[PDB]
Design a binder for these strands. Structure first.
Ligand SMILES: Nc1ncnc2c1ncn2[C@H]1C[C@H](O)[C@@H](COP(=O)(O)OP(=O)(O)OP(=O)(O)O)O1
Ligand SMILES: [Ca+2]
Ligand SMILES: [Ca+2]
Ligand SMILES: [Ca+2]
Length: 438
DNA sequence: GGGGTGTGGTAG
DNA sequence: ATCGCTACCACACCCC
């Protein structure tokens, strides 16, 4: 039990937080891409022709947590039991669940107590603990396999368990689906072997957006090849609106309110007009969804193909702690800001950078919300407040940054006992080169 | 056109 | 108990 006023809190929270791990793993994968390719341009151009293989472990955490589960939990079958990965017993997030559990309607992000109610009396919910180190070792095997194949002009990391692999098809060369299905089946089999029993699915197409939908269609433990030329009403009628990239819960609600609750991408595409779409969800997102409904990528999503090094370059750096924040006085808040600043500066120094703009953001208990929320140590219902500050010259100096961060906190007027969450952000970073003279 | 701010949204 | 992170894109409204 490490409390937020304990010097070890940040270490212990990050050690347990799957969302921290996902974000740290992604950041390390992007920096490794930059280093591996530091002397390899490997350029893709608008005139070039390519195929995308979008590869993703099926229920990654649940599959690995099961394969490596301790003897305390020997009594469960992956193919017949509803398995979830989570920390606790009641208001604890399901990090991952297996397709059996999903068959009952259970979803990642659900609380355990909610997913228990969805099980007909008789079947038992099996909760496995996280196995963070093994998640990363299986991932290592995965990215190693992908590299060893020497069949992709570009291997873009998406997350610990997900990558977008680009193969250039030269104008002279003739591609067949015979070749694609075999590349698909090789990848799936090598990864199954290299990871001791983990399965991936694969979407294969000639746009990023379609490969993504093809991969959704292929799950679980399969692969799907759907090119622009293969599009059909049958295909579109198989997807929900929030299967589209960029359509999260708020965009879904606006789409359902605007276009009379479509229930498939076929409904949406038979009903929309571009302008009504941009009116409902925004101009750029509107155009993106419009092009997506043709199977086509937008300008922003193509940039990762044309200049992946610019895209994967880190432009800001931050920490967010919105769980376990219970402080009594301004002294302990200041100490915590200081610990956060030191952590962020250690990271900033590891990447040889300075920052010229910082932000403090906080979560303050809603005036009518309970002091202790439903979730143990949760932030509960909160109001967000944020303030930023431009520095004089770029810096990595703790005295400048931590003092300004503590000043920013004071300007937001949040009593320490009402504090439920803090983010510390370095919004602009500057390169440190060999010449640091004035 | 540029830059400025604080907020909202998405994603594994 | 329980570990509700974090990068980056977009927008609204603001300065001349
Ligand atoms: N909040 C979260 N959002 C997404 N993934 C999360 C989250 N918390 C934990 N995870 C885990 C679930 C996975 O094991 C891993 C990668 O996420 P993701 O690929 O979306 O899910 P998944 O592999 O369990 O299911 P799917 O087969 O649908 O991809 O991260
Ligand atoms: Ca996955
Ligand atoms: Ca994934
Ligand atoms: Ca989506």
């Amino acid at each position: 039990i490490v409390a937020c006023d304990d010097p070890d809190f940040l270490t212990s929270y990050f050690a347990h937080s799957r969302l921290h791990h996902l974000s740290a793993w992604k950041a390390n994968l992007k920096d490794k891409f930059l280093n591996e390719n530091i002397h390899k341009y490997t350029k893709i151009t608008d005139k070039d022709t390519y195929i995308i293989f979008h590869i993703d472990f099926d229920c990654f955490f649940a599959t690995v947590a099961y394969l490596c589960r301790s003897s305390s939990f020997s009594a469960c079958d992956f193919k017949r039991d509803p398995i979830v990965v989570c920390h606790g017993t009641k208001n604890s997030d399901i990090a991952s669940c297996n397709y059996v559990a999903r068959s009952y309607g259970i979803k990642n992000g659900m609380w355990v107590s909610q997913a228990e109610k969805m099980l007909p009396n008789g079947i038992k919910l099996i909760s496995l603990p996280y196995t963070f180190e093994q998640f990363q070792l299986k991932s290592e095997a995965f990215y190693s396999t992908l590299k060893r194949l020497n069949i992709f002009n570009l291997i873009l990391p998406i997350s610990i368990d997900e990558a977008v692999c680009v193969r250039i098809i030269p104008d002279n060369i003739h591609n067949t689906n015979t070749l694609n299905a075999r590349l698909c089946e090789e990848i799936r089999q090598e990864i199954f072997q290299g990871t001791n029993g983990c399965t991936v699915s694969i979407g294969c197409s000639d746009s990023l957006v379609l490969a993504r939908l093809a991969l959704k269609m292929a799950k679980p433990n399969g692969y799907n090849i759907t090119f622009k030329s293969n599009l059909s009403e049958e295909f579109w009628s198989s997807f929900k609106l929030d299967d589209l990239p960029g359509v999260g819960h708020s965009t879904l609600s606006r789409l359902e309110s605007t276009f009379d609750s479509p229930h498939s991408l076929n409904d949406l595409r038979k009903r929309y007009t571009l302008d009504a779409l941009k009116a409902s969800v925004g101009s750029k997102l509107g155009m993106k969804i419009h092009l997506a409904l043709q199977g086509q990528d937008d300008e922003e999503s193509l940039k990762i193909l044309y200049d992946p090094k610019e895209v994967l370059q880190r432009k800001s750096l931050s920490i967010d702690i919105n769980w376990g924040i219970r402080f009594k006085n301004i002294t302990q808040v200041d100490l915590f800001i200081e610990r956060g600043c030191q952590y962020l500066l250690e990271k900033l120094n590891e990447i040889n950078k300075t920052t010229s703009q910082i932000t403090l953001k906080l979560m303050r208990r809603c005036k009518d919300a309970p002091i202790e929320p439903p979730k143990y140590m949760g932030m509960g219902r909160c109001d967000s407040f944020s303030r930023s500050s431009r520095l004089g010259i770029p810096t990595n100096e703790f005295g400048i940054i931590a003092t300004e961060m503590k000043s920013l906190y004071r300007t937001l007027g949040c009593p320490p006992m009402e504090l439920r969450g803090l983010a510390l952000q370095f919004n602009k970073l500057v390169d440190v080169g060999p010449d640091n003279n004035q």
